[PDB]
Design an enzyme around this catalytic site. Structure first.
Site, PDB file in Angstrom:
ATOM      1  N   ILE A 167     -22.903  -4.913 -69.196  1.00  0.00           N
ATOM      2  CA  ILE A 167     -22.793  -4.504 -67.773  1.00  0.00           C
ATOM      3  C   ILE A 167     -21.956  -5.526 -67.120  1.00  0.00           C
ATOM      4  O   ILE A 167     -20.816  -5.031 -66.404  1.00  0.00           O
ATOM      5  CB  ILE A 167     -23.919  -4.455 -66.934  1.00  0.00           C
ATOM      6  CG1 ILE A 167     -24.843  -3.240 -67.364  1.00  0.00           C
ATOM      7  CG2 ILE A 167     -23.473  -4.091 -65.400  1.00  0.00           C
ATOM      8  CD1 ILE A 167     -26.451  -3.390 -66.585  1.00  0.00           C
ATOM      9  N   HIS A 168     -21.995  -6.631 -67.402  1.00  0.00           N
ATOM     10  CA  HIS A 168     -20.892  -7.790 -66.655  1.00  0.00           C
ATOM     11  C   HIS A 168     -19.617  -7.437 -67.339  1.00  0.00           C
ATOM     12  O   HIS A 168     -18.625  -7.639 -66.749  1.00  0.00           O
ATOM     13  CB  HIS A 168     -21.485  -9.081 -66.974  1.00  0.00           C
ATOM     14  CG  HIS A 168     -20.570 -10.077 -66.734  1.00  0.00           C
ATOM     15  ND1 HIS A 168     -20.204 -10.356 -65.192  1.00  0.00           N
ATOM     16  CD2 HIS A 168     -19.747 -10.774 -67.182  1.00  0.00           C
ATOM     17  CE1 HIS A 168     -19.373 -11.395 -65.243  1.00  0.00           C
ATOM     18  NE2 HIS A 168     -18.965 -11.634 -66.582  1.00  0.00           N
ATOM     19  N   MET A 169     -19.577  -7.265 -68.824  1.00  0.00           N
ATOM     20  CA  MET A 169     -18.202  -6.829 -69.349  1.00  0.00           C
ATOM     21  C   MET A 169     -17.465  -5.875 -68.924  1.00  0.00           C
ATOM     22  O   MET A 169     -16.373  -5.648 -68.503  1.00  0.00           O
ATOM     23  CB  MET A 169     -18.485  -6.915 -70.776  1.00  0.00           C
ATOM     24  CG  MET A 169     -18.826  -8.164 -71.790  1.00  0.00           C
ATOM     25  SD  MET A 169     -18.766  -7.835 -73.548  1.00  0.00           S
ATOM     26  CE  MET A 169     -19.964  -6.765 -73.580  1.00  0.00           C
TER      27      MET A 169
END
Ligand SMILES: CCCCCCCCCCCCCCCCCC(=O)OC[C@H](COP(=O)([O-])OCC(O)COP(=O)([O-])OC[C@@H](COC(=O)CCCCCCCCCCCCCCCCC)OC(=O)CCCCCCCCCCCCCCCCC)OC(=O)CCCCCCCCCCCCCCCCC
Ligand code: HEM
Ligand code: HEM
Ligand code: HEM
Ligand code: HEM
Ligand code: SF4
Ligand code: SF4
Ligand code: SF4
Ligand code: SF4
Lengths: 216, 289, 216
Positions: A167-169
């Site tokens: 999700i962060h990427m």
């Protein structure tokens, strides 16, 4: 306001970040190979399955050390405050690309802060349970029952952190212009105005003001 | 691998791609250790190491007859001694310890390396070392604390139930050597019969709680005991009462996996359909019109 | 003509398309692993060779279902007509990037239409022969001779479709601006004028006209 870009991230925090990312790729993939044995190809993440078993924990430790350097340099900018509520309430609107309309965003937004603490808490959990299940060095000192719980928790924590990073990427890829800032260190003033209003307003003031303080 | 085509269970192998097992019409075998006839001579330790070509270190005496003090990569079976007065008079309870060859092995269930642990149709659970990565998961998965890592090659080893002898028609080395016949071997069906006959004799001598140790929690074992005090297995140097695969291990190796799988798939779908549905978040989506 | 972009593909047809692409990657690679056994790495497309044997046909069915949804939504725009001849005659000129000069291009050109029917015919052939050679479920009901022909045809059809897709991807990568339209859904009016004249002329007219019909 007469420059294409403004520095968002120092070289030292950029170097660290990409060191963590490379180590994480190896550690996450090796971890996944033990978790889902059917994905045989991943047993060669560190060359051979035998080697991967050995190296996973060492690279894991390196990630923790590096994340602790990141913790002491970014924590103060990730502190939850009443101004973060607005964000938390119009999440659906933020995901449609309309956050500015609905929230007060400083250096890092409320989502980034939640991710930050999630990431930081999980690496601590992974460190502790990891040491406990580490053979031949440490597992011997722990009661079998503790080792068993640690095996369950470590697997769970590892999976949670991998989801989080996915999700962060994505977000990084989604809020365009972001990856360049992490590689090169600079963000265009307009990117700052749209995604991080309050933050750029502060640099802008700090900027202009202290230069106005000099006495041109 | 799989040359014998009678592999009924294999570690880290998806349930929809089972191991080769067409030649499964074979009687299950079993070792029966009658501790009431054991004299603690340790002949079984010696015969095991001699046959298996292994030698542990020359240890130390720390106050008890037990030696080596624990199973190790070089000691696949050890005699465990217990002195007690818990039953009204001094008793010296002596028990041969080593792999129980569980019908539902926790070692195999916990193992993350495909083919590192297998179970044969006859009940023998064995380690296929070429596939062992030395993670040690099997040590925690085992309800009896049996697997032991060899520091010299990073692999686990344990009693193989002399698979190399049994596979060609001969009983294990420790079975054959036992001076008093405390250890018996044969098909599990007839060993259970011998066990019940022995329990009957012990009851006739006054051991009202004599019984067979063949734990249902692990699906029964292929190494069983006849105990004078089956109501108190802990008396025999910690033999577990009602052993079973630990709940945390069952959850970790069970439901957690498909759950995580669903999350991953669902997350990937969401993110992908999200990007496509809404589109990038660039500096100006407005002056594009 | 006062907008940077015009919608070329609806979200529903974009979602489908990229679902087909992901499934196709797995199915094509697993299929190739049986076709060229020397390429051992591909036997791990679905984790293990044993798993790949099982899953290939299931994902194949999914591709067919999705392609049938695509068929009923795109077929009417892929119908060959006399206006397509010009294309077919100056192929060499089109490949040099000079199609506009030589042809009448509507919604999708004559090459795209040929690809469309090739792709749609092959997936039908693959579906039928695939079911026939599917063990343990279906192969048992078919005469051995039919199974044998189906094994030959399925392999051939699969190879033909993979070649076709290679060419389809290339073109997509080649006529720049195309992939964005399939991911985001929009194409710039100039891209429409150059690569699909007649088509944009029609939207432009449909557009302006009905807005002129309103009675500004
Ligand atoms: C919408 C919601 C959709 C929900 C679907 C849920 C499916 C759950 C399937 C399953 O677990 O049932 C398992 C079922 C039962 O197995 P089991 O023996 O009881 O236990 C499983 C094993 O114990 C232990 O587990 P396992 O090892 O057998 O796991 C199974 C599965 C394992 O794979 C998965 O579960 C999902 C894959 C997740 C990968 C994670 C990648 C994350 C890493 C990123 C790090 C990046 C770093 C940043 C730097 O592997 C195979 O089945 C083939 C799947 C191949 C996916 C290939 C994708 C490549 C795309 C690229 C383009 O196995 C199967 O029937 C075939 C499953 C087919 C699914 C399609
Ligand atoms: C903080 C430092 C870490 C240490 C000391 C550590 C240690 C270990 C050890 C000792 C194992 C058992 C296998 C082996 O010996 O290789 C393991 C497994 C695993 N680790 Fe880590 N690890 C760490 C960090 C991480 C991180 C950051 C992740 C997530 C990306 C992760 C994910 C996993 C997974 C998924 C498994 C396998 C569990 C299973 O088989 O289900 N680990 N780790
Ligand atoms: C290839 C994958 C990754 C990409 C593209 C990526 C990208 C980024 C970017 C662009 C930023 C800063 C955004 C901004 O300036 O607002 C960032 C911050 C950060 N990243 Fe990553 N990252 C990746 C992987 C990781 C991993 C694996 C970790 C640790 C497990 C991590 C931890 C962090 C942290 C702690 C921050 C600071 C955020 C805050 O203070 O709230 N990143 N990343
Ligand atoms: C339409 C649905 C499909 C079904 C039911 C299907 C079914 C099958 C089956 C049952 C096999 C034999 C091996 C196995 O059991 O895994 C096979 C092989 C194969 N399939 Fe498919 N398939 C389908 C679609 C496709 C597609 C779309 C392609 C091309 C990308 C493809 C390419 C191949 C290839 C190259 C082989 C191996 C032939 C060889 O060994 O030379 N299949 N398929
Ligand atoms: C990564 C590989 C692929 C890429 C980059 C790609 C890209 C594209 C693009 C950009 C378009 C629309 C072009 C336009 O608007 O004129 C398109 C259309 C289409 N694609 Fe793909 N595609 C890929 C794979 C596939 C696969 C694997 C299939 C099915 C086997 C497929 C089937 C179709 C169909 C049926 C159309 C509609 C064309 C028409 O109606 O003539 N594509 N693709
Ligand atoms: S050889 Fe037999 S009698 Fe001797 S210690 Fe072992 S089980 Fe007991
Ligand atoms: S006693 Fe332990 S090592 Fe032996 S078969 Fe049972 S679970 Fe595996
Ligand atoms: S140490 Fe045990 S659990 Fe790990 S691979 Fe070897 S047999 Fe499997
Ligand atoms: S059955 Fe064989 S491997 Fe097991 S303790 Fe006896 S002699 Fe050793």
């Amino acid at each position: 306001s007469k420059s294409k870009m403004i520095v968002r991230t120092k070289f030292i925090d950029r170097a660290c970040h990409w060191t963590v990312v490379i180590c994480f790729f190896l550690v996450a993939l090796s971890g996944i190979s033990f978790f889902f044995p059917t994905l045989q190809w991943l047993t060669q993440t560190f060359g051979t399955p035998q080697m991967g078993r050995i190296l996973h924990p060492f690279f894991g430790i390196a990630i923790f050390v590096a994340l602790m350097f990141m913790f002491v340099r970014f924590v103060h900018h990730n502190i939850p405050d009443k101004k973060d509520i607005p964000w938390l309430l119009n999440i659906v609107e933020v995901l449609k690309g309309n956050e500015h309309k609905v929230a007060d965003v400083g250096k890092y937004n409320a989502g980034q802060k939640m991710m930050f603490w999630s990431i930081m808490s999980m690496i601590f959990v992974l460190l502790v349970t990891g040491v406990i299940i580490w053979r031949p060095y440490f597992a011997q000192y722990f009661p079998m029952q503790v080792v068993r719980y640690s095996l369950l928790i470590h697997a769970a924590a590892g999976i949670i952190l991998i989801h989080a990073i996915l999700i962060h990427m994505y977000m990084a890829f989604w809020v365009k212009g972001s990856i360049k800032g992490m590689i090169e260190g600079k963000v265009s003033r307009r990117w700052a105005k749209k995604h991080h209003p309050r933050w750029y307003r502060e640099i802008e003031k700090a900027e202009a003001k202290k230069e106005s303080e000099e006495g041109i | 691998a799989m040359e014998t085509q009678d592999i009924i269970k294999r570690s880290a192998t998806n349930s929809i791609t089972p191991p080769s097992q067409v030649r499964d019409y074979k009687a299950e075998v079993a070792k029966l250790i009658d501790v009431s006839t054991c004299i603690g001579c340790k002949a079984c330790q010696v015969a095991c190491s001699e046959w298996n070509d292994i030698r542990d270190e020359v240890g130390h005496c720390v106050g008890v007859y037990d030696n080596p003090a624990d199973l190790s990569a070089k000691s696949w079976t050890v005699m465990r001694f217990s002195e007690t007065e818990q039953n009204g008079k001094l008793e010296w309870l002596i028990r041969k310890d080593g792999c129980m060859h569980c019908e539902d092995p926790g070692c195999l269930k916990a193992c993350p390396s495909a083919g590192a642990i297998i179970q044969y149709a006859n009940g023998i659970v064995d380690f296929q070392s070429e596939n062992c990565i030395g993670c040690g998961y099997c040590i925690a998965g085992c309800p009896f604390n049996i697997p032991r890592l060899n520091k010299e090659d990073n692999r686990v080893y344990k009693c193989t139930l002399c698979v190399d002898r049994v596979s060609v028609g001969q009983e294990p080395a420790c079975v054959k050597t036992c001076p008093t016949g405390a250890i018996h071997f044969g098909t599990k069906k007839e060993m259970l019969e011998l066990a019940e006959q022995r329990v009957a004799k012990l009851k006739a001598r006054g051991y009202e709680h004599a019984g067979v140790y063949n734990p249902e929690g692990v699906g029964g074992t292929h190494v069983m005991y006849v105990l004078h005090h089956a109501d108190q297995p802990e008396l025999y140097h910690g033999l577990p009462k009602d052993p079973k695969i630990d709940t945390s291990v069952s959850l970790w190796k069970g439901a957690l996996k498909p759950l995580a799988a669903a999350g991953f798939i669902a997350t990937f779908a969401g993110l992908i359909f999200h990007y496509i549905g809404i589109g990038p978040n660039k500096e100006v989506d407005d002056d594009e019109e």
